[PDB]
Design a protein around this ligand. Structure first.
Ligand SMILES: O=C(c1ccc(-n2nnc3cccnc32)cc1)N(c1ncccc1Cl)[C@@H]1CCCNC1
Ligand SMILES: [Mg+2]
Ligand SMILES: [Mg+2]
Ligand SMILES: [Zn+2]
Lengths: 84, 50, 52, 153, 26, 57, 61
RNA sequence: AAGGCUAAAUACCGGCACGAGACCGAUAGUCAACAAGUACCGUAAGGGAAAGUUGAAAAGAACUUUGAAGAGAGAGUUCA
RNA sequence: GUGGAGCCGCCGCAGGUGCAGAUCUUGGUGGUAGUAGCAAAUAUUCAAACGAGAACUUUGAAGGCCGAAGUGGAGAAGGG
RNA sequence: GUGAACAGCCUCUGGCAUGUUGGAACAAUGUAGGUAAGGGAAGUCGGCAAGCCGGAUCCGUAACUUCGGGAUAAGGAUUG
RNA sequence: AACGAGAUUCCCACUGUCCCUACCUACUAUCCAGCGAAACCACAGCCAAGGGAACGGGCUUGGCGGAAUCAGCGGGGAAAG
RNA sequence: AAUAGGGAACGUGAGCUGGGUUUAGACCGUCGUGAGACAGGUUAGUUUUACCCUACUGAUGAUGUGUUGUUGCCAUGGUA
């Protein structure tokens, strides 16, 4: 009654998906998250696992607004447009 | 579940459009090596988990 | 290699089960699931005297 | 493609082949040995009577626990079995063999099965479900077959 | 011409070793 | 003899999902969801229950 | 010669089960042209799908 | 003394670029030379793979023939 | 003999330099072996059809069981 | 329908092809179910297992007791 | 006292528990078509005695030894886990 | 008639039985401040595999007399 007969009562969810990291780690009864620790202001990361930064450091996603600051840098951030 | 919040069936609608084969013209391009879609999900072997 | 093969959480299985006492990787699912982890013997292992 | 022991007289000899087809190997090995050196319009009438259980097929090397039968004594053996799928794939190939002999212009009522060998193909896999939550595999054993047809004249 | 599918690692769960403990009272 | 089912997606006989059943002009014995029972106002100042009259309960 | 769709849809237009519906194996390819329900109601009036009424359960004993 | 600022010499396994190696050469080198932190597992923290090569050119076998097809046997391409 | 683009002598130098065993790691395959087995809940039969192909698909006829706390009709949760 | 009954058992409405296969034969051992002369626990650590009694109406109901019980005690009969 | 799937002794009744087993049926097992695993495995597998790590399959001295196999069996393989 | 003594891994558990032993529950006695202990007493307590080789019980067989059949001989083995 310990094993396969009692895996039949897995019917209701606990962890749904969060809104800041999208992880299926938002614990509904606690209303926090497993990876990011959602409603606290910071981002939950730790130095006791060097892979769990490797999943979510800067440089793992799109970088919509740092692919340009890297590009804008090498001209001194101009504002005068162009010649003709 | 038949009672689903709207975030779920815009999460399910992405995971239905991608369960779909490669078109036969894209196996004729210059320099590919994909020959069948290996991210195909079948609803009994591998489930999404919400 | 700066740190090869140790970037893996594994342990010896310990008890019987008719396996050698090499550390095995954890988990389930994928192929690399119970294989022999770090040690010069094993595939994907830290070499003997990782050179400095 | 390439055969073993390409025949001694290629002008008056037909050939045929089928590959990566799903039979059992062991049931096909010990029926290709029974007709190895049999005249084609006797082998054709033979392999009908194998499927109808009117003329058996002895198992010689691959006979572990194979039960005994009474029609084996024509072959001088105490074992046999009547594989009506193993003897039904290569019944189809004799049709394929005589189709190439008439296209090369040979009298098909005068051929013998000179050479025939059955060798194994890459085994395709699936799985079963055993006690205490283990998995043990079902694997097939498809075969490659190959025959050369020579007349005696 | 269907693409290859499945063949995932078994990942079988560990079970108990040597069944009943038994032993000798001696 | 004609087993009949719920028509709303609440499959229990709870406090608000309790009914009667009636026969349509298309003579199928259908299952019709009724209102709860109203209760009349009881009098002020500690008199016996059994409510007022003249009013719509 | 699959008739199972026509077996379902006639049982949804006679208001009966799958057991009761359908006599007449003569015109079998003919009713395999009937897919819409406004072809499957013409076949009832033409006499190709009948009701095949109830097994008798007499209370006389 | 219980108040304050301050350049060089110094430190850089994150990054944006580079250059080189008495390195490793697909069970190696990072976990990854390829749709790799991807497939997949776990409720979740987390664990996490296998997988390079036709040829100069696809010229990737038109066509005839037995079979319903899988597959052949002839013919054809190419240096193979 | 196959194979198609690299390689070796000698003098020095430098090592991640030699395998039969580690209940060794990883990949591969055997004997076992056409063997254990495909045996819980009574049970199928005849003809016609589409088919290259019919015990298992459909259609009919017959014999059956579930038998209204159902092997029936609808749901919540879960699955997508 | 029977019956006290939503028990059990047969059927109508509604399902279903006998539960991941079929055919031939009726050896041992087995698994599940039955019987058996004469004797009746001699079996065996133990009456283990099995069997007997079992529904109702009318009689009859002891020791003991916290006077509630015991008790449907036991023990007879009857049934179409 | 009532109660207990509690523990023990004896009697009446009942019975294959026994004398002493027998017969029948069902699903098997068995033969066949189709699909078809695993544990395990140095090499393999005929015994008696002697010697030996004091209890051999192999060595020593005798007995002796014909292919290939089918259904069963639990003596052994100081069997396997 | 006699109710002689034994051996066979204190014969015999992939033959069984689990009574007593010899886990975890528990009670009592003695001892220990205590945890606990006691060849002290008591009740409750999961017994796995054979389809491998041999051995053995049976069933086809193989050699050689040219092939096939019929009727016989007895080496050896058992022996009540
Ligand atoms: O199923 C088992 C079971 C049987 C044997 C093993 N073993 N033993 N050694 C083994 C080595 C390899 C594999 N398995 C092994 C494991 C479990 N049971 C069981 N039986 C007796 C004792 C313990 C148990 Cl759990 C249940 C219990 C209840 C009644 N029905 C059976
Ligand atoms: Mg490689
Ligand atoms: Mg004699
Ligand atoms: Zn989150």
């Amino acid at each position: 009654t310990k094993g396969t007969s009692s895996f039949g009562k897995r019917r209701n969810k606990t962890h749904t998906l969060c809104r800041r990291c999208g992880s299926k780690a938002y614990h509904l009864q606690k209303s926090t998250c497993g990876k990011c620790g959602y409603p606290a202001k910071r981002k939950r990361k730790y130095n006791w696992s060097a892979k769990a930064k490797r999943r979510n450091t800067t440089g793992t996603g799109r970088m919509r607004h740092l692919k340009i600051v890297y590009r804008r840098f090498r001209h001194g951030f101009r504002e005068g447009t162009t010649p003709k | 579940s038949s009672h689903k919040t709207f975030r779920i069936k815009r999460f399910l609608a992405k995971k239905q459009k991608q369960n779909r084969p490669i078109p036969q013209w894209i196996r004729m391009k210059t320099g590919n090596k994909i020959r069948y879609n290996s991210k195909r999900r079948h609803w009994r072997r591998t489930k999404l988990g919400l | 290699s700066e740190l090869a093969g140790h970037q893996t959480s594994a342990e010896s299985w310990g008890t019987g089960r008719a396996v050698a006492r090499i550390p095995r990787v954890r988990g389930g699912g994928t192929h690399r699931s119970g294989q022999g982890a770090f040690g010069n013997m094993c595939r994907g292992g830290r070499m003997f005297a990782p050179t400095k | 493609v390439r055969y073993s022991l390409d025949p001694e007289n290629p002008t008056k000899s037909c050939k045929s082949r089928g590959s990566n087809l799903r039979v059992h190997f062991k049931n096909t090995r010990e029926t290709a040995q029974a007709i190895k050196g049999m005249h084609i319009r006797k082998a054709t009438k033979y392999l009908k009577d194998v499927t109808l259980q009117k003329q058996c097929v002895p198992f010689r090397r691959y006979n572990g626990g194979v039960g005994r039968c009474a029609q084996a004594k024509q072959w001088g053996w105490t074992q046999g079995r009547w594989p009506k799928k193993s003897a039904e794939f290569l019944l189809h190939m004799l049709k394929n063999a005589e189709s190439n002999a008439e296209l090369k212009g040979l009298d098909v009522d005068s051929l013998v099965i000179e050479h025939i060998q059955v060798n194994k193909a890459p085994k395709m896999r699936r799985r079963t479900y055993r006690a205490h939550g283990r998995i043990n595999p079902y694997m097939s054993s498809p075969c490659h077959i190959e025959m050369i047809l020579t007349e005696k004249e | 011409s269907w693409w290859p599918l499945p063949l995932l690692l078994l990942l079988l769960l560990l079970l108990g070793p040597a069944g009943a403990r038994a032993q000798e009272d001696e | 003899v004609q087993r009949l089912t719920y028509r709303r997606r609440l499959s229990y006989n709870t406090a608000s999902n309790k009914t009667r059943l009636s026969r349509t002009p298309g003579n199928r014995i259908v299952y019709l969801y009724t209102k709860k029972v109203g209760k009349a106002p009881k009098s002020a100042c500690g008199v016996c229950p059994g409510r007022l009259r003249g009013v719509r309960a | 010669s699959m008739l199972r769709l026509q077996k379902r849809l006639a049982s949804s237009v006679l208001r009966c089960g799958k057991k009761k519906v359908w006599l007449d194996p003569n015109e079998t390819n003919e009713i395999a042209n009937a897919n819409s329900r406004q072809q499957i109601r013409k076949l009832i009036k033409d006499g190709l799908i009948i009701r095949k009424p109830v097994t008798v359960h007499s209370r006389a004993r």
